[PDB]
Structures are given as C-alpha cells and as structure tokens.
Amino acid sequence: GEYPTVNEIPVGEVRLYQIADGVWSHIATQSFDGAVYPSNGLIVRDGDELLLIDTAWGAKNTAALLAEIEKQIGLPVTRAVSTHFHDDRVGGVDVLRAAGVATYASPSTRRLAEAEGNEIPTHSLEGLSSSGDAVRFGPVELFYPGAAHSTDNLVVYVPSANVLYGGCAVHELSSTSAGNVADADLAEWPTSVERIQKHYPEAEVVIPGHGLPGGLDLLQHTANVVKAHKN
Numbered sequence: 001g002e003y004p005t006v007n008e009i010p011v012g013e014v015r016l017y018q019i020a021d022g023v024w025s026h027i028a029t030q031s032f033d034g035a036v037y038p039s040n041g042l043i044v045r046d047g048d049e050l051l052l053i054d055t056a057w058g059a060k061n062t063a064a065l066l067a068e069i070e071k072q073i074g075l076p077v078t079r080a081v082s083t084h085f086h087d088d089r090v091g092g093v094d095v096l097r098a099a100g101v102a103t104y105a106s107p108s109t110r111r112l113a114e115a116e117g118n119e120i121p122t123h124s125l126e127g128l129s130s131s132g133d134a135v136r137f138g139p140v141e142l143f144y145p146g147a148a149h150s151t152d153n154l155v156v157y158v159p160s161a162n163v164l165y166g167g168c169a170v171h172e173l174s175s176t177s178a179g180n181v182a183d184a185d186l187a188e189w190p191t192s193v194e195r196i197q198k199h200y201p202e203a204e205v206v207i208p209g210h211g212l213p214g215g216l217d218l219l220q221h222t223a224n225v226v227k228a229h230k231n
C-alpha cells in the first residue's frame with residue numbers, strides 16, 4: 001500500500017523502497033513519447049558494498065539514484081547489471097561508469113544496445129546465452145529465461161530473501177496491455193514465464209519492471225496480458 005506510484009514521483013527524483021533485509025527497489029519516472037511512466041530497478045547489499053540492477057532510466061535520474069543511495073544506505077555501489085538493452089535499463093550507464101561503478105550485461109544485451117545507439121555496459125556476462133542458464137553474480141543469481149519482452153531479457157533472484165526481480169519481462173497485476181512489444185517474442189514469452197515459474201517456485205516477492213511488486217501471481221498474469229495482446 002506504500003509503494004510509490006507514477007503521479008507521486010516527479011521526473012528527475014528517485015525513491016527507494018525496502019523489499020527485505022538488504023534488498024531495495026529503486027523507483028524513477030521518465031517521459032517517453034509524450035507520456036510519463038514509472039520504472040523499477042533493484043539494489044542488493046553485497047557485504048559492505050551494493051550491487052545495482054538496472055539504471056533509473058536516464059542520466060539525470062541515474063545521478064539522482066546514486067545520491068539517494070548515498071543518503072539512505074551509505075554503502076558504495078560497486079557493480080551494476082543491466083537486464084536488457086533498452087533505455088530504461090542502460091540509460092544512465094555512462095553516469096554509473098563515471099562514478100566508478102563497474103557495469104555489466106550479457107553479450108546479447110551489449111550488441112543490441114550498440115546497434116540501438118544506447119549506452120553500453122563495460123563488461124560482458126558469459127554463461128547466459130541459452131534459455132534456462134543461471135550464473136551467480138555477488139549476492140544474486142542471474143537467469144536467462146528465454147525471449148520474452150526482448151530476446152536478451154534477464155531476471156534476477158536474491159536467494160537470501162526469495163526476491164525475484166523480473167524486469168520488463170514481468171508486468172504488474174494492474175496491467176491491461178503489454179507495453180512496448182517492438183522487440184518482444186510474443187509466442188515465446190509464456191514459455192519463458194513458465195521457465196521462471198519452474199526455476200523460482202519459492203519466490204515470495206516478484207518485482208515487475210514497471211509498477212507494483214506482488215507475489216508469484218505476477219508471472220501468470222504476465223502470460224495472460226501477453227496472450228490478450230496476441231489476439
């Protein structure tokens with residue numbers, strides 16, 4: 001009931017929301033094709049450091065995110081992972097890299113970001129090119145579920161907290177439309193959701209790329225949203 005909504009966050013401000021011990025989401029807003037949308041990422045405590053998942057969608061938002069983390073948490077962000085190549089995930093990577101954060105993404109995401117003219121994470125994450133692949137990265141597991149919202153989309157699990165961050169492959173419960181599907185695989189998306197459901201059956205919190213966290217029901221809801229879009 002306290003998660004911040006789009007009309008509560010002016011463009012350029014970032015909120016943090018405590019999900020579990022050592023796990024936060026970050027929430028920002030951005031204008032795109034003349035409409036404002038909220039967007040989520042993740043922060044995970046990594047001893048006396050933090051791991052960031054996704055930018056706050058833009059250079060100014062990402063600078064505000066680092067300032068909010070400094071104020072609220074006070075531990076340095078040392079690494080960041082972007083979960084796909086679009087601007088709500090990589091826009092702000094240059095700000096992170098100037099702030100000394102080591103930025104990472106799969107080779108699939110890096111090639112697509114490059115081709116798109118988007119910012120490119122520095123380092124390549126091998127071991128994620130096949131659907132069902134999983135790799136450990138600090139306090140999280142990165143999982144490639146297969147093509148869904150994009151061909152390169154990753155999801156992130158925090159085993160200590162049973163938190164699943166789905167990024168843009170997972171929609172919030174109130175969603176009635178599939179968002180930007182220009183780079184999506186609408187036929188594979190339900191199968192990729194099924195793989196996530198099978199691999200993370202103990203997830204307690206599921207965080208979508210945009211909107212409110214909930215439970216495991218966000219996964220089936222997302223498959224349903226995608227099916228309604230398809231027909």
Ligand SMILES: NS(=O)(=O)c1c(C(F)(F)F)ccc(-c2ccc(C3CCNCC3)cc2)c1-c1nnn[nH]1
Pocket residue numbers: 032037086087088089149168171174175176177178179180181209210
């Ligand atoms: N990642 S993206 O590329 O495709 C994207 C961008 C971007 F800036 F980054 F260019 C801008 C806006 C959106 C966007 C995000 C959410 C919605 C809908 C909002 C109401 N409930 C159903 C979903 C519509 C659009 C999206 C997006 N994310 N997930 N689905 N679409």
Ligand SMILES: [Zn+2]
Pocket residue numbers: 084086149150168
């Ligand atoms: Zn996207």
Ligand SMILES: [Zn+2]
Pocket residue numbers: 088168209210
């Ligand atoms: Zn998105």
